[PDB]
Ligand binder design. Structure first.
Ligand SMILES: *[C@@H]1O[C@H](CO)[C@@H](O)[C@H](O)[C@H]1NC(C)=O
Ligand SMILES: *[C@@H]1O[C@H](CO)[C@@H](O)[C@H](O)[C@H]1NC(C)=O
Lengths: 319, 172
């Protein structure tokens, strides 16, 4: 009696090292990498709607700067904002810059609504030498510069618009800041000037500052931009003893805001991927990624490790 | 592993066995052979692929979040934003680290377990007709041709047919 039957298991010449609780270097027959460390050198326009701002950052696109006309009407899941965006107008500062930028990006669309404001004796459509769209002095096409009567007179102005629409409105208005006391009296009238924008709930007012400022743009004056949200059932009042960069309208606000902005210089390509990093899109089924903490869409979770191998086979013990 | 079969009383694996994770290697009067065991192989693959599916696909569908890069420091608010993200990343890094370690520890135990279940299954088939040699091999105490060997592998082996011959060889 000497037949023999042996029970055994497979093995390969060379396996993969994995970690366990008790050993950080165990050789198993097969393993699967759980950390995506390769990205694409482009951004996928599908299935998410990516809108390329190109030369305009999202603030300049909303303002209506020269060269931002393509962004009109545009709807996006992700707004792609270039690091080499360039200011192309009479220039400015937004006091709560990040918060405005956030609201516009999250909102998801640039749907502008025209409405006409009956300004009194005061002019309209004032333009500038630092904001010139195709050859010809201009301004933010969503804003309207009011300047002096011919017989120098700017009455206190109050108009009012009422939101009986079924959506919340976003009005964007500005305040002009002159370099001199003469510049104000030139432009017009008063000294000081001032703007007070009210809603039922609120009332925001500004008095212009007047001083020697550096030379960007080639002027020493600047504009300060503000915004006001008007819910269905609310109103917005514009008061000016001077200097209002008045609005031509309001933007439409989605009830549900589900969009966002991604700032990167990566070109847009042909691929399909629901996951975008600032280094480019990701095309993976892995649960984790070490590529960038800036990640948007349907993405693996960002982790610090460059590799985490999951054993998909038994220990490898060859011979 | 916990059962001490793989890298245990089986001293090594079989590079020749390429159509299964586990199998039989025999020797009898007419020769030798290696054959895969499908049931044990499938039992291990199914368990591992189960882990893979629980893993690949969970829902991390995020859109509008917070700023994570900054030109210049601003103080209090920026510090909170940075701290929030840094805290998130450490916790998720920890989860990924522990997960892989846990899964891997378990996977190795499962495969060691499946090897041992196979050995034990065959041990039970042979009853008193065979003795454990100690290296995952049974000495069979009766002439056992290829049909006999196949009957062991496919589970149709009837120990009563050989018991008289086997008992007599074992004990005298
Ligand atoms: C203008 O202001 C007066 C009070 O000074 C107010 O009663 C009136 O409703 C305002 N009209 C508009 C059109 O804003
Ligand atoms: C991600 O991991 C790879 C190796 O897996 C490494 O080469 C790369 O530098 C890592 N990326 C970062 C941003 O650390």
């Amino acid at each position: 009696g000497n037949p023999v039957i042996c029970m055994g298991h497979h093995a390969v010449a060379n396996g993969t090292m994995v970690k366990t609780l008790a050993d950080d270097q165990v050789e198993v027959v097969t393993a699967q990498e759980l950390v995506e460390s390769q990205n694409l050198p482009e951004l996928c326009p599908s299935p998410l709607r990516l809108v390329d701002g190109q030369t305009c950052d999202i603030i300049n696109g909303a303002l209506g700067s020269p060269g931002c006309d393509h962004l009109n009407g545009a709807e996006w899941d992700v707004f792609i904002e270039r690091p080499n965006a360039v200011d192309t107008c009479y220039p400015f500062d937004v006091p709560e810059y990040q918060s405005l930028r956030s609201i516009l990006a999250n909102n998801g669309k640039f749907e502008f609504i025209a409405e006409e404001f009956q300004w009194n004796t005061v002019k309209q459509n004032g333009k500038s030498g630092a904001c010139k769209r195709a050859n010809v002095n201009d301004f933010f096409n969503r804003l309207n510069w009011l300047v002096k009567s011919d017989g120098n007179a700017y009455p206190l102005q109050n108009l009012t618009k009422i939101n009986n629409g079924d959506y919340a409105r976003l009005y964007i208005w500005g305040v002009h800041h002159p370099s001199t006391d003469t510049e104000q009296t030139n432009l017009y009238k008063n000294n000081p000037g001032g703007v007070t924008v009210s809603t039922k709930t609120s009332q925001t007012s500004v008095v212009p500052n007047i001083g020697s400022r550096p030379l960007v743009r080639g002027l020493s004056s600047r504009v300060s931009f503000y915004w006001t949200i008007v819910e269905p059932g609310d109103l917005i009042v514009f008061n000016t003893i001077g200097n209002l960069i008045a609005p031509r309208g309001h933007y439409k606000l989605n009830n549900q805001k589900k969009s966002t902005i991604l700032n990167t210089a990566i070109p847009i390509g042909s691929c399909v991927s629901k996951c975008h990093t600032d280094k480019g899109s990701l095309s993976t089924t892995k649960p984790f990624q070490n590529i960038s903490r800036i990640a948007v869409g349907d993405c693996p979770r960002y982790v610090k490790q460059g590799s985490l191998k999951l054993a998909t086979g038994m220990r490898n013990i060859p011979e | 592993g916990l059962f001490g079969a793989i890298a245990g009383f089986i001293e090594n694996g079989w590079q020749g066995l390429i159509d299964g994770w586990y199998g039989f290697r025999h020797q009898n009067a007419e020769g030798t052979g290696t054959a895969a065991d499908l049931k044990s192989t499938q039992a291990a693959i199914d368990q591992i692929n189960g882990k893979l599916n629980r893993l690949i696909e969970k829902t991390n569908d995020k859109y509008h979040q917070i700023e994570k890069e900054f030109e210049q420091v601003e103080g209090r608010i920026q510090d909170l934003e940075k701290y929030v993200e840094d805290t998130k990343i450490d916790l998720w890094s920890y989860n990924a680290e522990l997960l892989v370690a846990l899964e891997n520890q378990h996977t190795i135990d499962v495969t060691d377990s499946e090897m041992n279940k196979l050995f034990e299954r065959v041990r039970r088939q042979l009853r008193e007709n065979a003795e454990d040699k100690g290296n995952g091999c049974f000495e069979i105490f009766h002439k056992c041709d290829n049909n006999c060997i196949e009957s062991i592998r496919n589970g149709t082996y009837d120990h009563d047919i050989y018991r008289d011959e086997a008992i007599n060889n074992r004990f005298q």
